[PDB]
Amino acid sequence: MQAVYLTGPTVYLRAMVEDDKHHAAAWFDSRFPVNAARAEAFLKEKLQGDPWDARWHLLAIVRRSDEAVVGSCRIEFGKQTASLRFHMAPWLDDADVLRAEALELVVPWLRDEHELLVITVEIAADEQRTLAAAEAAGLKAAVRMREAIARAGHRVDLLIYQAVDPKV
Amino acid sequence: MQAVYLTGPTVYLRAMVEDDKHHAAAWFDSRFPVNAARAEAFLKEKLQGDPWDARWHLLAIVRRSDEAVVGSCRIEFGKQTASLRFHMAPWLDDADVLRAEALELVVPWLRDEHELLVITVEIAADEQRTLAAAEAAGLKAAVRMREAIARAGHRVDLLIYQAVDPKV
Amino acid sequence: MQAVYLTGPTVYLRAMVEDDKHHAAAWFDSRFPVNAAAFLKEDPWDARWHLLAIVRRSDEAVVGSCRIEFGKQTASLRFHMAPWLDDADVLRAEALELVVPWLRDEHELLVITVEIAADEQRTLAAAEAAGLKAAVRMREAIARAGHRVDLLIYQAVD
Amino acid sequence: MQAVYLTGPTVYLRAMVEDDKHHAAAWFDSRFPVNAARAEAFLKEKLQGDPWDARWHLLAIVRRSDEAVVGSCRIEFGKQTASLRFHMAPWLDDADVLRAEALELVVPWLRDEHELLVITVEIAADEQRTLAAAEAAGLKAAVRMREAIARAGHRVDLLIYQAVDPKV
Amino acid sequence: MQAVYLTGPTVYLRAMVEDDKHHAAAWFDSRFPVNAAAFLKEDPWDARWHLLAIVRRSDEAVVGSCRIEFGKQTASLRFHMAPWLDDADVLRAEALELVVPWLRDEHELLVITVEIAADEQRTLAAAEAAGLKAAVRMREAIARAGHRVDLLIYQAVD
Amino acid sequence: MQAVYLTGPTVYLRAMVEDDKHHAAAWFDSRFPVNAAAFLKEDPWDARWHLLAIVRRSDEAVVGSCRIEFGKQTASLRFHMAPWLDDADVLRAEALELVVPWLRDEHELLVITVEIAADEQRTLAAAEAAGLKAAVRMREAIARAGHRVDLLIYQAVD
Amino acid sequence: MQAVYLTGPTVYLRAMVEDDKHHAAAWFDSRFPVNAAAFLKEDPWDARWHLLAIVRRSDEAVVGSCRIEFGKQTASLRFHMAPWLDDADVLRAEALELVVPWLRDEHELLVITVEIAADEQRTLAAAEAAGLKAAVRMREAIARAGHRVDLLIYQAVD
Amino acid sequence: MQAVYLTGPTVYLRAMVEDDKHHAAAWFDSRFPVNAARAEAFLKEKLQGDPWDARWHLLAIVRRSDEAVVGSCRIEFGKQTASLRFHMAPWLDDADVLRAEALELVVPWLRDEHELLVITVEIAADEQRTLAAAEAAGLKAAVRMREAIARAGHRVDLLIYQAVDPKV
């Protein structure tokens, strides 16, 4: 994953390094969550494989104009699965445009460079551009988690978008 | 819901009253969660209806032999949906047998006495008897939430079981 | 405030007395708070405020409290409901419905202030019906089961 | 200390029992503090004796008119010392009058029934009646702890009142 | 708000920009908070509010923030100062001294609201000099070193 | 463990039953914990452990618990006492005094482990009298009134 | 311990010095702890323990610590890794792999104890390969992102 | 206080600046405590003066050999009083030697450059060298706070040392 270089008009993705984590410490939690996507359509357990064999990765999302790390993409591989979520810097003016571009970049890489039957992405229901990026990448809304996400004055659903190979 | 009386060989369900909540305060959290089932298959929003119109209910699960409140069933209605989860007393010797019986009791009541297109139940992957009760009630595993539930020394998946009317 | 009784269809409010506070103290012997700062020992800041018990009419149970803190110009309200209470939002909304017109028809105030959590649908609806509008919001200040909600400050200015 | 019975016009003091602690659990913390009086004039360590030999006691303060436990007096004996603090119920209308009476009752008992060279009492600077009770009992302000006590909108000093035998 | 600059003898306020927020985010990479709810990702509740950076004139350092949330009738202020800041109370008081007359001489508001901790002597003194009076008090809502202080809500009504 | 009774001058230990756990659950409906992680729903990690009630002889009250978790070679003990309990340290020390010789005279163990807070004088003294020595210390893991104390792990190896 | 160097393929351990501790202190200037009780000021309890720095060979960075506390019979280990560390579990496991044989081939101990979180797969695997077995479990004592994990105490007895 | 320069063989004291506070953020709490010395002999309130007139200062303690900030001295002036406490870096090998030197440096400065009737210093009972420095500076133990300070496995007293002008 040291070779990953996925660039668009505004941002590029590359392996997150210790330097990134340190600078972003105020908002980026380095500690491991239980998984990189909270919920998923119920499918055969075997697709995930053994926990010893799970592989976690972190990609920095880097703004081209100033080289600022503006977010991260956390990815968790199982045997035939990839699960991911994005963490954008809270100081960003419009996190959604940059998150959406990052999703456009990472999905085709995930489909091509790996042997996956399932791709699973967390996207909040108010993340318009990111939802649209997922739809154009051929992902489909699979799970609704009602009011799972705190916003100012209200809560919104967390949605889980998936592409699942026909074989499954 | 004051008329509800659903009894099996071991437990019965009736409206939870303030007395129950007070006695069970050590383990029963009276505060509202965001919903009664955390995740669900992605279906049309309209099925849930407006939040002003949502109706929440609490059923006590009562052990017949001694009249002890051994758990609760939290139910959240939307327009055409019912979502539920169980909270069993931590001092119970075998919570799963009694939870499973409670699920056997509450499901047929939910199908008959209400006009539902969707029933949604949270069940942890290690809850053997409760899983079996759900399957016999005609519910099917719809969502997997990996390692969502803390246990001693390890974590287990939360599963979401559903029955969804053909019309949907 | 000793001769004041505000009666609605479900609850009534009257001056809270020591015995009420005795029993409300246990509305905190709990591992699941909605907020932090039981009650504490009550010049100059302990002069401005006053308590009304919310009593359910059906069984005469004390089911909540309404705290009213005064400025020269002002009155600010805060509710605390028993944790085991059935239909707390309906009852709290009714108390608000009772206290606001009292503060209007029996006081001369430039500003009435009320604290209400962002998820308290019925209490919010009664505040809006009484003419109050949201003025301040404090993010994730109120604890619920597995999540937090914002505290809203509603105000009317006459 | 089962024989203690110290009564005034309004309250009496007797050994606090498990029943008291349970009822008062909302406001009374049964857990041990490090001592029963936080600060004291610096005097010879030997006066306190060994920690194995320390003896802690709890007296309930009981309102005569209704038998309500309205507070507690926590006492810590060393070899030749007695240290104490009061915890009054937060629902009390006028805690200070009842605290002050309790102090009037407990001090003469402490001087007579025990062989003390030092008595040490915590009293907040705004506790008028309690301060006056201490002065009339022949205690003197020895220590000031500035702004140690939170009140509504402001903080007040904790004062430590003492009587110390001439021999010391 | 992009062409607005309020200059006092020590600090000036101007619209906060992304770069300012970038560096202010670290005013939370800390085990010693004064409050809880770094910043979070910014319809309908994220429409009403606006940020001003407080910049120290001597070295052009961004040393704090002033958050202004609007109602139709209202404006409510909240300050956050860098944790390492020398003389934070003097600088915050000066910012208040600057923002209040701006909200008066350049807006048409019925009510101005400001949050101030009960121990912020100089900020309180500037609020009183600006005509604001305490309206609401929230006990022990602000964390300090080994103790907590109350949050006060000050208001003026024109 | 159903036919096991260890009787001392003040308390006795026997297998804990559901009814005991029912009432012990409330030893947590409280805002003042000594530790965190009421009880939780009890393969493979829920196989190794077992509970003994500590019953006060004078009134037959269940006043505490002794949790014994087993390895192939090992036994590890943890006590929880009712919060309202008079003389909890004396009673807990006596329970320890009872359980340790039982684990010796009626089991074949290479290692016995016990958790004890650093301020539990009498419990510590009984652990030392039973031949146990401190092995591990976890700083400020136990909450007391206005302070914390260390958790000590004592062990004997036969 | 000043002339002790344990070198593996990825890291090596040597006596920790003041400068290492200086920089490790910031492994706590953070709002996301894994545990509680930065470091604190170091008779009689501050006699038994000792620190080894874990240094990554590729860049000579100090990336973690190994704390060894001694009894007469005993040695107990505790690791703390830098929060930004890549592959912390692999590196920690390697340190364990290095320290255990050292405590065997260069000490005379009846019991070696190690703390390891229940989710630290590779560290657990090295403890089992070194002959250690789980002895004690403390439920949900370690904080992770949005959840907690148990702390396990592993031990070998020679 | 920008002119303060107090140097000994090992450390020097100078005004703490924002740079110091930032670097030391892991261990140095910039937030204000209620006072700089927790307890003090009970003397006339007027000596402290008005809170509006209180002046707080921070001195960095700087190790000469490497210019490292190894601690801080927090000082609070009232009208005729000075109260202080030290915060040493936790990574220090022997904090007590350097704290003690810092106390040797700051006391004569406090007596000479200011018009004080009272100097009040917090010192833990196990801080041998610091206690000895205070004694040689002509301070005397005035207050004992039993077991106020957590240490590894045990607690120690906080002591308050004072010099008080004869006039008082």
Which DSSP category does C25 fall into? Answer: T
Nearest CA-CA distance, residue A29 and chain G, Å = 7
> Which among C67, C76, C49, C72 has a CA at the least distance from the CA of C135?
C76
Domain that residue A134 falls in: 2-168
Looking at the DSSP bridge assignments, the partners of residue C70 are C75
Taking CB atoms and an 8 Å limit, are G140 and B150 in contact across chains? yes
**3-state secondary structure (DSSP) of residue C88:** helix
Sheet of strand A118-124, all strands in order from the earlier edge strand to the far edge: A6-7, A11-15, A55-63, A69-77, A81-88, A118-124, A154-164, A140-151, B40-41
Specify the DSSP element, H or E, that contains F94: helix F88-105
Taking CB atoms and an 8 Å limit, are G30 and E31 in contact across chains? yes
Task: Return the residue matching tokens 């005279």.
Answer: F105
Q: Looking at beta carbons, which residues of chain A come within 8 Å of C148?
A: 150
Are H135 and H144 a contacting pair, CB within 8 Å? no
Q: Looking at beta carbons, which residues of chain D come within 8 Å of E139?
A: 152
Task: Return the residue matching tokens 């993010």.
Answer: C139
Which DSSP category does H47 fall into? Answer: G
Could you give the CA distance from residue E65 to residue E24 in angstroms, rounded to a whole number?
9
> Which among B106, B113, B109, B129 has a CA at the least distance from the CA of B121?
B106
- Tell me whether strands F111-117 and F74-81 are parallel, antiparallel or unpaired: parallel
Are D9 and D101 a contacting pair, CB within 8 Å? yes
Sheet strands (E) in C108-147: 111-117, 133-143
Taking CB atoms and an 8 Å limit, are G83 and A31 in contact across chains? yes
∠ CA(H61), CA(H66), CA(H69), 5° rounding? Answer: 25
Q: Hey, which chains touch C, using 3+ CB pairs under 8 Å? A: A, B, D, E, F
Residue G15 token pair: 């006596």
Residues of B in CB contact (< 8 Å) with C are 17-18, 21-22, 25-26, 29-34, 51-52
Burial call F18-41: b when 16+ CB within 10 Å, e when fewer: eebbbebbbbbbbbbebeeebbeb
Are A82 and A120 a contacting pair, CB within 8 Å? yes
**Residue E49's Cα: distance from chain center in Å?**
12
- Chain E residue with the nearest C-alpha to that of C77: E136
**HEC assignment per residue over chain E:** CCCCEEECCCEEEEECCHHHHHHHCCCCCCCCCCCCCCCCCCCCCCCCEEEEEEEECCCCEEEEEEEEEECCCEEEEEEEECCCCCCHHHHHHHHHHHHHHHHHHCCCCCEEEEEEECCCHHHHHHHHHCCCEEEEEEEEEEECCCCEEEEEEEEEEC
Could you give the CA distance from residue H39 to residue H160 in angstroms, rounded to a whole number?
7
Could you give the CA distance from residue C30 to residue C36 in angstroms, rounded to a whole number?
12
Looking at the DSSP bridge assignments, the partners of residue C69 are C49, C76
| CB within 8 Å of E11: residues ≥ 6 apart | E54, E55, E56, E57, E63, E91, E94, E95, E98
Burial call C66-104: b when 16+ CB within 10 Å, e when fewer: bbbbebeebbbbbbbbbbbbbebbbbbbbbbbbbbeebe
Residue E149 token pair: 């202080």
Residues of B in CB contact (< 8 Å) with F are 25-27, 68, 88-93, 95, 151-154
Number of residues assigned to chain D:
168
> Which among E125, E158, E124, E153 has a CA at the least distance from the CA of E137?
E153
Residue C149 token pair: 């909600």
Are C66 and C13 a contacting pair, CB within 8 Å? yes
Phi/psi at G110 (nearest 5 deg)?
-85, -30
CA distances from F26 to A161, D140, E141, F62, F143 (A): 43, 43, 29, 12, 18
**Residue B18's Cα: distance from chain center in Å?**
19
| CATH of residue E31 | 3.40.630.30
Of A25, A26, A90, the CB nearest to E41: A90
Residue C57 token pair: 């009419």
Residue F103 token pair: 């684990």
What is the dihedral sign for C-alpha H128, H134, H136, H142? negative
Residue H154 token pair: 């045990």
Which DSSP category does G35 fall into? Answer: -
| CB within 8 Å of H56: residues ≥ 6 apart | H32, H36, H74, H75, H76, H77
What is the dihedral sign for C-alpha C26, C28, C29, C34? positive
Number of Cβ within a 10 Å radius of residue A79: 15
Nearest CA-CA distance, residue G47 and chain B, Å = 33
Q: In chain C, what is the straight-line distance between the N-terminal and C-terminal CA atoms, in Å?
A: 23
Sheet strands (E) in chain C: 5-7, 11-15, 49-56, 61-70, 74-81, 111-117, 133-143, 148-157
> Which among D82, G131, B88 has a CA at the least distance from the CA of F41?
B88
> Which among C26, C28, C84, C76 has a CA at the least distance from the CA of C56?
C84
**3-state secondary structure (DSSP) of residue C24:** helix
Q: What are the DSSP calls for chain A, one per residue? A: -TT--EE-SSEEEEE--HHHHHHTTTT---S--S-SSS-EE---GGGG--GGG-EEEEEEEEETTT--EEEEEEEEE-SSEEEEEEEE-TT-S-HHHHHHHHHHHHHHHHHHSS--SEEEEEEETT-HHHHHHHHHTT-EEEEEEEEEEEETTEEEEEEEEEEE-TT-
**3-state secondary structure (DSSP) of residue H102:** helix
Looking at the DSSP bridge assignments, the partners of residue B118 are B81, B164
- Burial group, residue A168, by CB count within 10 angstroms (0-12, 13-18, 19+): exposed
Number of Cβ within a 10 Å radius of residue H27: 22
**3-state secondary structure (DSSP) of residue G156:** strand
Taking phi over 0 as left and psi of -120 to 50 as alpha, with beta for the rest, B165 belongs to: beta
Burial call D22-35: b when 16+ CB within 10 Å, e when fewer: eebbbbbbbebbbb
Sheet strands (E) in B29-151: 40-41, 55-63, 69-77, 81-88, 118-124, 140-151
Are E71 and C133 a contacting pair, CB within 8 Å? yes
Are E35 and E143 a contacting pair, CB within 8 Å? yes
CA atoms within 13 A on the CB side of F14: 15
Residue C22 token pair: 């005795």
Could you give the CA distance from residue D74 to residue D30 in angstroms, rounded to a whole number?
10
Number of Cβ within a 10 Å radius of residue H66: 10
Could you give the CA distance from residue A112 to residue C97 in angstroms, rounded to a whole number?
62
Number of residues assigned to chain G:
158
Could you give the CA distance from residue E40 to residue E48 in angstroms, rounded to a whole number?
15
Nearest CA-CA distance, residue A84 and chain E, Å = 19
∠ CA(A10), CA(A13), CA(A14), 5° rounding? Answer: 140
Phi/psi at G97 (nearest 5 deg)?
-55, -35
What is the dihedral sign for C-alpha A109, A112, A116, A120? positive
Q: In chain G, what is the straight-line distance between the N-terminal and C-terminal CA atoms, in Å?
A: 23
Phi/psi at A107 (nearest 5 deg)?
-60, -50
CA distances from H45 to C62, D151, D157, H41, H76 (A): 45, 19, 11, 11, 15
Taking CB atoms and an 8 Å limit, are H144 and D35 in contact across chains? no
Number of separate helices (H) and strands (E) present in chain C: 3, 8
CA distances from F61 to B106, F2, F94 (A): 38, 19, 15
Nearest CA-CA distance, residue G37 and chain B, Å = 22
Are C48 and C70 a contacting pair, CB within 8 Å? yes
CA distances from A148 to C119, E92, H68 (A): 14, 37, 47
Q: In chain F, what is the straight-line distance between the N-terminal and C-terminal CA atoms, in Å?
A: 23
Looking at the DSSP bridge assignments, the partners of residue F54 are F13, F64
Of A17, A31, A51, the CB nearest to G34: A31
**Residue G74's Cα: distance from chain center in Å?**
16
Taking CB atoms and an 8 Å limit, are D32 and F121 in contact across chains? no
CA distances from D49 to D34, D39, D53 (A): 15, 17, 7
- Suggest the residue from C29, C41, C70 to mutate for an interface test with chain D (most D CBs closer than 10 A): C41
User: Domain total for chain E?
Assistant: 1
Could you give the CA distance from residue C49 to residue C75 in angstroms, rounded to a whole number?
9
**Residue H2's Cα: distance from chain center in Å?**
18
Q: What is the resolution of this structure in A?
A: 2.2
Are E83 and H30 a contacting pair, CB within 8 Å? yes
Could you give the CA distance from residue C120 to residue C89 in angstroms, rounded to a whole number?
6
Nearest CA-CA distance, residue F2 and chain G, Å = 24
Residue C15 token pair: 């001056």
Could you give the CA distance from residue G155 to residue F38 in angstroms, rounded to a whole number?
29
Of F22, F29, F45, the CB nearest to B25: F29
Sheet of strand H11-15, all strands in order from the earlier edge strand to the far edge: D40-41, H140-151, H154-164, H118-124, H81-88, H69-77, H55-63, H11-15, H6-7
Could you give the CA distance from residue G137 to residue F78 in angstroms, rounded to a whole number?
11
Of A88, A91, A93, the CB nearest to E25: A91
Phi/psi at C24 (nearest 5 deg)?
-70, -30
Which DSSP category does D12 fall into? Answer: E
Are E95 and E64 a contacting pair, CB within 8 Å? yes
Could you give the CA distance from residue H34 to residue A43 in angstroms, rounded to a whole number?
59
Q: In chain D, what is the straight-line distance between the N-terminal and C-terminal CA atoms, in Å?
A: 27
As a whole number of Å, the CA-based R_g of chain F is 15
Specify the DSSP element, H or E, that contains G52: strand G49-56
Could you give the CA distance from residue G134 to residue G114 in angstroms, rounded to a whole number?
9
* Cβ contacts from A onto C, under 8 A: 12
Number of Cβ within a 10 Å radius of residue A42: 19
Q: What are the DSSP calls for B68-80, one per residue? A: -EEEEEEEEE-SS
What is the dihedral sign for C-alpha G19, G23, G28, G32? negative
Taking CB atoms and an 8 Å limit, are G22 and H152 in contact across chains? no
Residue C119 token pair: 């998820």
Sheet of strand A40-41, all strands in order from the earlier edge strand to the far edge: A40-41, B140-151, B154-164, B118-124, B81-88, B69-77, B55-63, B11-15, B6-7
Looking at the DSSP bridge assignments, the partners of residue C113 are C76, C155
Which DSSP category does H46 fall into? Answer: G
Are H109 and H4 a contacting pair, CB within 8 Å? yes
Residue A44 token pair: 């055969």
Taking CB atoms and an 8 Å limit, are F30 and C33 in contact across chains? no
Are D98 and D92 a contacting pair, CB within 8 Å? yes
Are B36 and B73 a contacting pair, CB within 8 Å? no
Number of residues assigned to chain C:
158
Could you give the CA distance from residue E45 to residue E37 in angstroms, rounded to a whole number?
15
Nearest CA-CA distance, residue B157 and chain G, Å = 14
Looking at the DSSP bridge assignments, the partners of residue E146 are none
Q: Can you list the pairs that D46-55 forms with residues at least 24 positions away whose Cβ atoms lie under 8 Å?
A: D46/D79, D47/D78, D47/D79, D47/D80, D47/D81, D47/D117, D47/D118, D47/D168, D48/D78, D48/D79, D48/D81, D48/H146, D49/D78, D49/D79, D49/D80, D50/D79, D51/F121, D52/F121, D53/D78, D53/D79, D54/D78
Sheet strands (E) in chain F: 5-7, 11-15, 49-56, 61-70, 74-81, 111-117, 133-143, 148-157
Are E70 and C133 a contacting pair, CB within 8 Å? no
Task: Return the residue matching tokens 């300070």.
Answer: H149
Are F131 and F82 a contacting pair, CB within 8 Å? no
Could you give the CA distance from residue D167 to residue C97 in angstroms, rounded to a whole number?
68
- Burial group, residue D2, by CB count within 10 angstroms (0-12, 13-18, 19+): exposed
